[PDB]
Amino acid sequence: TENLYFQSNAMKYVDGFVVAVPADKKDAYREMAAKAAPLFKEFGALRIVECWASDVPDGKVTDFRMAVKAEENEEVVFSWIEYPSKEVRDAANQKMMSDPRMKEFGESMPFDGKRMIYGGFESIIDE
């Protein structure tokens, strides 16, 4: 529910992900993320959001499909995880990597890990 104190103060750091996912694997992907999400929260994540292409324009210089070298059978996913600080983000990711829960239902990735793009970013505007 809306809470202006949490809204104002909670997030300071974001891990952003852009993924190419086979279109027929939408459900598999959603299920994987639904399994991962509570784990990230356990480790200090504030929120995990995964968004499936709806209206993604094609360009000649750059575009979201070019960014993940998307193949004809694939759709672009735009996703992120919100954290209270870089330090919590770092701790969470280290934990995730040492968790057998994501060793299992996590190594069956319904997408090409090589083409995923990823980075940590500091919040500069959040309104």
CB atoms closer than 10 angstroms to residue 14: 19
Residue with tokens 């784990």, as numbered in its chain: 39
Kindly state whether residue 87 participates in binding Na ion, applying the rule CB under 5 A. Answer: no
Per CB under 5 A, the list member of 94, 104, 121, 126 interacting with Na ion is 94
Q: For residues 67 and 63, what is the distance between their CA atoms, to the nearest angstrom?
A: 6
Q: For residues 67 and 57, what is the distance between their CA atoms, to the nearest angstrom?
A: 12
Name the one range near Na ion by CB under 5 A: 9-17, 35-43, 58-66, 116-124.
58-66
Find the shortest distance in angstroms from Cβ 31 to a second copy: 9
Kindly state whether residue 115 participates in binding a second copy, applying the rule CB under 8 A. Answer: yes
Q: For residues 81 and 88, what is the distance between their CA atoms, to the nearest angstrom?
A: 12
Kindly state whether residue 43 participates in binding a second copy, applying the rule CB under 8 A. Answer: no
Q: For residues 16 and 35, what is the distance between their CA atoms, to the nearest angstrom?
A: 18
Distances in Å between the Cα of 115 and the Cα atoms of 4, 10, 16, 73, 97 are 37, 31, 14, 14, 19
Kindly state whether residue 42 participates in binding Na ion, applying the rule CB under 5 A. Answer: no
Find the shortest distance in angstroms from Cβ 27 to a second copy: 9
Chain contacts with Na ion (rule: CB under 5 A): 58, 63, 94
Chain contacts with a second copy (rule: CB under 8 A): 11, 13-14, 16, 18, 26, 29-30, 33-34, 37-38, 41, 47-57, 59, 61-64, 66-69, 76-80, 86, 114-127
